[PDB]
Write a protein that binds this DNA or RNA. Structure first.
Ligand SMILES: [Mg+2]
Ligand SMILES: [Mg+2]
Ligand SMILES: [Mg+2]
Ligand SMILES: [Mg+2]
Ligand SMILES: [Mg+2]
Ligand SMILES: [Mg+2]
Ligand SMILES: [Mg+2]
Ligand SMILES: [Mg+2]
Ligand SMILES: [Mg+2]
Ligand SMILES: [Mg+2]
Ligand SMILES: [Mg+2]
Ligand SMILES: [Mg+2]
Ligand SMILES: [Mg+2]
Ligand SMILES: [Mg+2]
Ligand SMILES: [Mg+2]
Ligand SMILES: [Mg+2]
Ligand SMILES: [Mg+2]
Ligand SMILES: [Mg+2]
Ligand SMILES: [Mg+2]
Ligand SMILES: [Mg+2]
Ligand SMILES: [Mg+2]
Ligand SMILES: [Mg+2]
Ligand SMILES: [Mg+2]
Ligand SMILES: [Mg+2]
Ligand SMILES: [Mg+2]
Ligand SMILES: [Mg+2]
Ligand SMILES: [Mg+2]
Ligand SMILES: [Mg+2]
Ligand SMILES: [Mg+2]
Ligand SMILES: [Mg+2]
Ligand SMILES: [Mg+2]
Ligand SMILES: [Mg+2]
Ligand SMILES: [Mg+2]
Ligand SMILES: [Mg+2]
Ligand SMILES: [Mg+2]
Ligand SMILES: [Mg+2]
Ligand SMILES: [Mg+2]
Ligand SMILES: [Mg+2]
Ligand SMILES: [Mg+2]
Ligand SMILES: [Mg+2]
Ligand SMILES: [Mg+2]
Ligand SMILES: [Mg+2]
Ligand SMILES: [Mg+2]
Ligand SMILES: [Mg+2]
Ligand SMILES: [Mg+2]
Lengths: 130, 155
RNA sequence: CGACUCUCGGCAACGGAUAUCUCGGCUCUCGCAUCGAUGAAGAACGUAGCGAAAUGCGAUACCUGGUGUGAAUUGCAGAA
RNA sequence: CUAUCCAGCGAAACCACAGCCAAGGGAACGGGCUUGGCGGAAUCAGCGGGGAAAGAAGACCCUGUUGAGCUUGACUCUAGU
RNA sequence: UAGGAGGGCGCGGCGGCCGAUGCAAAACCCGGGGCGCGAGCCCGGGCGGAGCGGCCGUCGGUGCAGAUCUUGGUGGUAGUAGCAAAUAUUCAAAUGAGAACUUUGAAGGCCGAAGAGGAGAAAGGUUCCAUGUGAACGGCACUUGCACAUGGGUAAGCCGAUCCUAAGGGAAGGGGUAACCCCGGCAGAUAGCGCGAUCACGCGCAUCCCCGAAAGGGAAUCGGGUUAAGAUUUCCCGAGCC
RNA sequence: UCGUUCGUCUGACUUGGGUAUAGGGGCGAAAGACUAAUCGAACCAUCUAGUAGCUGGUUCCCUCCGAAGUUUCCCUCAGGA
RNA sequence: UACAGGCGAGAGACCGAUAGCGAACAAGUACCGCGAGGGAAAGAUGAAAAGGACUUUGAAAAGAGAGUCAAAGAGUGCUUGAAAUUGCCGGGAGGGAAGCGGAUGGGGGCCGGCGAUGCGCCCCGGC
């Protein structure tokens, strides 16, 4: 149960916050989980998903399909992954939509900012357990 | 989509329908009613004769005001009937469409007969007219839905 | 046998009730004290590669700059 | 020229349920009740007897401790002089 | 009957208890079976596709047939009343899926110029012109259009406005006013000073500011050409004028 | 509104535009006429859910009990105690 | 101490699209009035547009096949989808209303907890 009398526990406000969040806020909301191998290696559970990351679907009808992130299409709360597609009636091919909370990031697109971000998150999870 | 009726033998049936057609529901209802159970070749010629004002359509439910004529004497003794031209043309469109449907499948065109013809009212469209003393009254149309099924006659 | 009228049932229409919802409303409580001649509130006209409205902005015109974040915007096209 | 008949288009008023009469009784002039006369599908064009037909919470009259326009020797005031 | 009371039924929340549901919740549908004197209730079948129910206590915007009730939807009337002023159309051909209604030609008629002709002021605002077009709309119809869509189109020293005053309006100092506001002749170093001068000074200051007419007053233009749509005088050619 | 028929037509004539008068006020060759289909006091909003002894309506079941149109007073007689 | 405005919050035995503010939506909008002013209606496909290629008839709109989907009969005003009223198919009845209450007779339609086959003595032959 909440203690901070500045955070709202109302269904109406919490939904408004979610569905009217700006782009800089959807990056955190559309966050994915590290794989078992990476969670073991970086000591972080989950990260905000990036353009060139590699994922594996773990819940959809496409469960067990791996691929590369090709678009983090924040305006629809979705990511398209390479070759995760279906064909339209006319025969054209379209990329199907995946929510970041139903994939695991099997490989990281690491940068200077990502390395620092992994550090800060790793410094944290240890700072409570120890 | 779904018709009011299942074809008695669906393999030897062709079907046509049209929705929201701007023709009078009442006249179109009488036209269809007088066509039911006819063989197709008689159906096409009967309707063409009404268009050429040579045969008539009896009016039975919606008849209050309709004039009397000698042509409809064989079927309606009280002589009351008309020649709804626009109704006959619309049905000829769908009758020919269902005939084309059958030739695709492979039915015996000369063995076909109207197994089911149905007219239903559609959403009325609105216009308006002007009456004395600065008043407005509705001036509306009564469009109809038509669905038909031709079936091969069995012995 | 039929037509018409009334009626029962099945199917199909017409219409938008009901149910299930809800970034809205209403009510209560709390914090704070900040318009203008240095031109306000309000009004007008413009402004986007493709826009009419709403939203935003002012010939630097759906923005310029700084700072934070850290890889998108997206209906299509293009520099990338 | 309409009305009339045809192709096309296409309203509204009104509507408890309805719609053949005679007498009786009845809120003292019934379409329905009582007792009689009768009474046979479905349709077209007219007509103005009836529906105490429609239109409009009678404008006449009365009531109300409801008004308002106007008048004056009504009561109480008031600008002006 | 008017009226009073008791015991129940039903609806939606809250505190508690006991439960159903993707092996199909709610709602709705039925010539399905039952229970209760009744309010109502239980089950079957179907439809639907994610929520719901019973019991105790407690609470309320809690039960409809009426109110010329409110809003919405729907009938009969009824394919009916009706489409009848302004004299009038006809033949061929073209087009087109389709022609009484479009187009060309021919014929027959009308307005008869205080016109059914040619141009403007007000008012409108793109209706103007070309190209195309499914629906709707043009109370029949349409290939069509004053509709719809996409484009195009309004050129001035000389036409106007603009300048001047009319009736009249607003107005500074002043007078009134609780203040918003109301008063312009009341006469105040009245607003503005004007003119000659600059190389500075002089003179004079009288009935005085602004607004108010695309029909009053008023600097100046004519002819000939030109577009799908602009011009008689805005563009082109020539010739003038203020 | 339309048809025919009528009144007047050098005048106290017809008419456009501008301007003045605004609600117990205007304006009236006077009809209580006209003041935007509104006039014996316009229209708009508010006070305002104005008041009504008067008309209309007033939503589930069963069971039990069950009337009054009479007295007195009231500007009281369609009302109330 | 006050605080229907402003800005920033947090709650609720409140309403659930005819309710709640007039406005959940390009709502003080469209539209009306010379004006002061008046003032609406209108939310919901699907998990994902995967929003229906192609063939055939038609001038077209569309239809019939097909394709997508768990589903389109969820097909761009698309969750569910009531009633009034309407069409078709099947059945029934009718001499100037119909409907209604009690009876029953004929048809339908439906009902297997709609309606039982078990219990006591016994003789084995095994548990
Ligand atoms: Mg007639
Ligand atoms: Mg009028
Ligand atoms: Mg006719
Ligand atoms: Mg009699
Ligand atoms: Mg009577
Ligand atoms: Mg009798
Ligand atoms: Mg008879
Ligand atoms: Mg008659
Ligand atoms: Mg009569
Ligand atoms: Mg009456
Ligand atoms: Mg009365
Ligand atoms: Mg009295
Ligand atoms: Mg009085
Ligand atoms: Mg006196
Ligand atoms: Mg409540
Ligand atoms: Mg209530
Ligand atoms: Mg009701
Ligand atoms: Mg009642
Ligand atoms: Mg007629
Ligand atoms: Mg007439
Ligand atoms: Mg002349
Ligand atoms: Mg034109
Ligand atoms: Mg038309
Ligand atoms: Mg001037
Ligand atoms: Mg002038
Ligand atoms: Mg002039
Ligand atoms: Mg020149
Ligand atoms: Mg006359
Ligand atoms: Mg004369
Ligand atoms: Mg004359
Ligand atoms: Mg005049
Ligand atoms: Mg004048
Ligand atoms: Mg008088
Ligand atoms: Mg009240
Ligand atoms: Mg009374
Ligand atoms: Mg509302
Ligand atoms: Mg509203
Ligand atoms: Mg389904
Ligand atoms: Mg569905
Ligand atoms: Mg759903
Ligand atoms: Mg639906
Ligand atoms: Mg129904
Ligand atoms: Mg039948
Ligand atoms: Mg009976
Ligand atoms: Mg029986």
């Amino acid at each position: 149960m909440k203690r901070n009398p500045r955070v709202t526990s109302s269904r109406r406000k919490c939904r408004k916050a979610h569905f009217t969040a700006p782009s800089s806020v959807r990056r955190v909301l559309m966050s994915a989980a590290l794989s078992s191998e990476l969670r073991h290696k970086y000591n972080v559970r989950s990260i905000p998903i990036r353009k060139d990351d590699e994922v594996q679907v773990v819940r959809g009808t496409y469960k067990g399909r791996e691929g590369k992130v090709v678009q983090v299409y924040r305006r629809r709360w979705v990511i398209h992954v390479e070759r995760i597609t279906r064909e339209k009636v006319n025969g054209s091919t379209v990329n199907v939509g995946i929510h970041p909370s139903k994939v695991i990031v099997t490989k990281l697109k690491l940068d200077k900012d990502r390395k620092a971000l992994l550090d800060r998150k790793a410094r944290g999870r240890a700072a409570d357990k120890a | 989509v779904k018709y009011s009726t299942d074809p008695a033998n669906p393999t030897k049936s062709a079907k046509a329908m049209g929705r929201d057609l701007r023709v009078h529901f009442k006249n179109t209802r009488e036209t269809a009613f007088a066509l039911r159970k006819m063989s197709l070749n008689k159906a096409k010629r009967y309707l063409e004769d009404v268009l050429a004002h040579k045969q008539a359509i009896p009016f039975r439910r919606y008849c209050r005001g309709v004039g009397r004529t000698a042509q409809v004497k064989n079927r309606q003794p009280n002589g009351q009937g008309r020649w709804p031209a626009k109704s006959a043309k619309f049905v000829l469109d769908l009758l020919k469409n269902a005939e084309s449907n059958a030739e695709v499948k492979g039915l015996d065109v000369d063995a076909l007969y109207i197994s089911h013809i149905q007219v239903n009212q559609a959403q009325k469209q609105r216009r308006r007219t002007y009456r004395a003393h600065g008043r407005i009254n509705p001036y509306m149309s009564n469009p109809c839905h038509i669905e038909l099924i031709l079936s091969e006659k069995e012995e």
